[PDB]
């Protein structure tokens, strides 16, 4: 059915793309077998503060399977200027810088 928040690290496939619509589309590869789980992703201003400032366009990002190597597509509306796309937390948290002109 469905579990908590994904506990394993993710991996970015390619590089976030500009949709020319003010949003970015990125593909992630999940490495865990604990799904179905919710993807911990967010658009924050600085790494010094993980308070979500941007907004997810994709509805409640999820890994729908309990098999590894699952890939998920996400569209976000990061704030203007600098921000980071952060996935995961703790020791398995990863981020990707971004700047919206």
């Amino acid at each position, epitope marked *: 059915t469905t579990y908590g928040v994904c*506990s394993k690290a993710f991996k970015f496939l390619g590089t976030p793309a500009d949709t020319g619509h003010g949003t970015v589309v990125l593909e992630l590869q999940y490495t865990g*077998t604990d799904g179905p789980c919710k993807v911990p992703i967010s658009s924050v201003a600085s790494l010094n503060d993980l308070t979500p400032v941007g907004r997810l366009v994709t509805v409640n990002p999820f890994v729908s399977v309990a098999t*590894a*190597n699952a890939k998920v597509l996400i569209e976000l509306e990061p704030p203007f200027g600098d921000s980071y796309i952060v996935v995961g937390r*703790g020791e398995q948290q990863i981020n990707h810088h971004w700047h919206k002109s």
Partner: antibody
Amino acid sequence: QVQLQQSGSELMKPGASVQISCKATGYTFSDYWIEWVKQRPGHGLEWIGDILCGTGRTRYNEKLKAMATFTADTSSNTAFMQLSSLTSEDSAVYYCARSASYGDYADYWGHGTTLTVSS
Amino acid sequence: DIVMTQSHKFMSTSVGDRVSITCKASQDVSTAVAWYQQKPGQSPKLLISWASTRHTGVPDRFTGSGSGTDYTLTISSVQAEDLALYYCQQHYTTPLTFGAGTKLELKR
């Protein structure tokens, strides 16, 4: 330095119940899954189950003829495994392993604690 | 559950040669396979994760490769310190399963 110190080997009466401990140090205890792997002397490796120390979520190899229970004491950063109704079948070296951030593979193993079920 | 079957358990090779212990999974484990090395009276040691990712503290003479259902652990220029038991493990889904292991032996 990530390291796992397990409890010492032990001889238990069949039917009895035992608790193997696994003290984690050198890393954020709660952000990982501790795996429990079994290996009977002449056999290979078999997955007993794991536990997400940070949330307490457990996953057991349901099909194993053994009653296992995982608990994580985030206060002492120690993962335990309770094994009840012991059998000569459960006699084996039990390993404590840490599940890597990048998948259900273990990157750090304890030196294993040997459990012998015998009268 | 997913069954992991490795190539013949008692394989031989000569120091310096190249060997390959194979691992077959009863189904596509989507590249999610790891290899461990276990020396007499020692805890298993992680060698490869995700078919080809070489763990640190692991000499590059150890390379893994694989996908779908077949995975190979190649040891280029085998050494005497490589004598050990080698297991593959799929990390595609629970329950996690290991191969019976392959014992590397040398011809001299």
